[PDB]
Structures are given as structure tokens and as C-alpha cells.
């Protein structure tokens with residue numbers, strides 16, 4: 001049965017949401033999002049209204065991608081879908097999509113920036129990121145854009161992963177957090193990349209939680225690459241060969257060879273086990289980085305690691321990515337996914 005919708009204007013656009021959602025207030029950065037009190041579940045929720053979802057093929061495909069991703073993610077440490085609705089009564093008038101998720105009070109960026117983090121806080125926070133990433137990667141999904149701002153956290157330090165990378169050139173330019181957590185292979189388009197790019201991001205985050213400082217705050221791509229290589233050393237012959245970009249390979253070979261630095265001398269006073277894990281994450285060769293599944297079993301997480309409570313994901317069919325469809329087809333697929341949504345228990 002259809003709920004009653006009511007409307008209000010929240011900064012230049014009309015929100016039409018079901019009555020269960022009250023006290024809407026904008027929170028901007030994450031898209032077009034409102035905090036809301038959900039009266040049926042008693043939860044504080046985030047309601048995102050999609051922005052012109054079917055105005056182009058790329059937009060319509062994006063909207064479907066986003067809904068597909070969110071409907072599949074059911075894990076404590078990954079943002080999931082509480083609800084999805086449109087005020088539209090049929091396909092013909094279907095033109096707006098609204099998404100409802102948990103609203104966690106803060107992001108990791110405000111945590112590291114405002115509070116001192118004990119080594120035990122670091123254990124728990126990274127543990128949770130890895131636990132959710134094992135789940136994410138097990139579905140063959142790559143986040144691609146892991147940074148402190150898309151790690152939501154509550155009062156109890158419980159964490160969910162948000163905003164799967166699904167950026168323009170300018171946004172990646174200069175002295176910007178948008179690029180500081182990016183694996184060098186994506187940053188510079190070295191090769192066809194995979195899910196361990198997400199592990200490099202975790203390395204940078206973990207480092208920053210331990211020291212309270214960005215690990216590689218490059219002023220631009222090249223400066224950042226230098227910051228990276230000073231720490232991990234320049235590529236060996238084996239890696240140079242795996243860079244499929246001739247042009248990128250040729251550039252990296254112009255650099256004075258440097259060895260990998262001693263991580264105990266960079267992360268002074270840190271847990272030796274934390275140092276070890278960092279050395280295994282911040283490996284230049286992605287083939288050799290530690291996987292999230294492998295990381296969870298590392299000694300650093302002895303306290304939180306529970307092999308029976310680190311679930312993988314159901315199969316995720318993303319063959320739609322290969323498909324070229326018409327706006328109307330992408331829109332009909334999105335509609336079918338809206339109409340068949342069943343709330344969680």
C-alpha cells in the first residue's frame with residue numbers, strides 16, 4: 001500500500017517524502033541530503049534525493065548503478081538501504097528517486113581532526129574498515145574512493161563505509177584530500193586497476209589515525225608521487241614491466257632510484273604490529289599488497305578478529321555495466337528496483 005507524501009522546500013528544490021519522515025534538515029557535500037527522524041523505526045536517517053536522475057544516458061545509468069549497489073550492501077560496516085521511494089504513481093510520471101540510509105553522527109575526518117586516537121581506537125576503526133571491505137570486495141565491487149570523509153562513525157566508534165566511487169580533473173588538482181588517499185596506479189593511470197587500490201587507501205588512513213597527519217599530502221600528482229616513492233622506494237624492474245602505459249613507465253624511469261624507508265623511523269613510537277601491517281598495505285606493486293581478508297587475520301587485530309563474524313557478500317551481478325541501453329530502458333530498470341524494494345528487519 002502507498003503511504004501519504006507531504007512536501008516542503010529545502011533549499012531551491014521541493015522534497016516530497018512519506019509522512020513517516022519528519023524534521024528534515026539539510027546536512028551539500030554528499031549530494032542532496034537531509035537528516036530526518038524516521039518515526040516507524042525510531043532511527044535518525046539520511047535521505048538523499050537524486051539529482052535529475054534520467055536527464056542523460058550516463059545519468060540514468062548512474063542512478064541505476066547507485067540503486068543496485070545500495071540494495072545489495074547488507075553488512076554492519078557498509079552503508080545500506082533502509083528505504084527507497086518515489087512519489088510517482090506509475091512509470092510514466094517516475095522522475096525522482098529518494099534513498100534512505102542510517103545517519104551516523106560524524107565522519108572519520110572529524111574524528112582524526114578533533115580527538116586524540118589511542119592505538120586501540122586505531123585497531124577498532126581499521127578493523128571495521130577491513131571487515132566491510134572484505135565484504136565489498138567479495139562481491140567484486142571496488143570502492144575506489146576511500147578517504148576519511150566517507151567513513152561514517154557513531155558515538156561508540158562504530159563505522160560504516162559510504163560513497164562508493166561511482167571525479168573531474170579539477171577536483172583532483174592541487175593540494176586536495178580528493179587525491180591524497182589514491183593508489184599511485186589510479187592517480188597516474190599506470191595500468192588496469194583492481195580492488196587492492198582500496199587497500200592502499202586504508203594504509204593512508206591508518207597512518208593518519210596513528211600520527212594525526214596526512215601521509216602523502218601532495219601539492220599535485222607529481223609531488224604526491226614523490227612523497228609516495230620517498231617512503232616506499234622507486235619501482236623495481238618487475239613493476240615497471242606491469243605498467244601498461246608506455247608514457248607513465250617512461251616518466252617513472254627518469255627518477256633517481258630510492259630505497260624503501262624504515263617504517264619504524266617514520267611511525268616513531270607506534271605499535272610494531274601497526275608498523276608491520278602498514279608495510280604490507282603500502283606496497284607499490286598492487287599484486288603484492290595484503291588483501292582485506294588476509295589483513296583481518298593479522299596479529300594487530302587479535303583483539304577484534306572473529307573468523308565466524310566476518311561475512312562475505314551474496315553474488316553481485318553487474319553485467320549491466322557492459323550494457324548500452326536507452327534512457328527509458330535504464331529508467332524502467334531503476335523503477336523495477338524501486339518497486340521491488342523490501343525493507344530490512
Ligand SMILES: Cc1nnc(-c2ccc(C)c(-c3ccc(C(=O)NCC4CC4)cc3)c2)o1
Pocket residue numbers: 027030033046047048066069070079099100101102103104105106107152162163164166
Ligand atoms: C552508492 C552510495 N554510496 N553512498 C551512498 C549513499 C546514498 C544515500 C545517502 C543518504 C548516503 C549517505 C551519505 C552520508 C551519510 C553520513 O552519515 N554522513 C556523515 C557526515 C555528516 C557527518 C549517510 C548516508 C550515501 O550511496
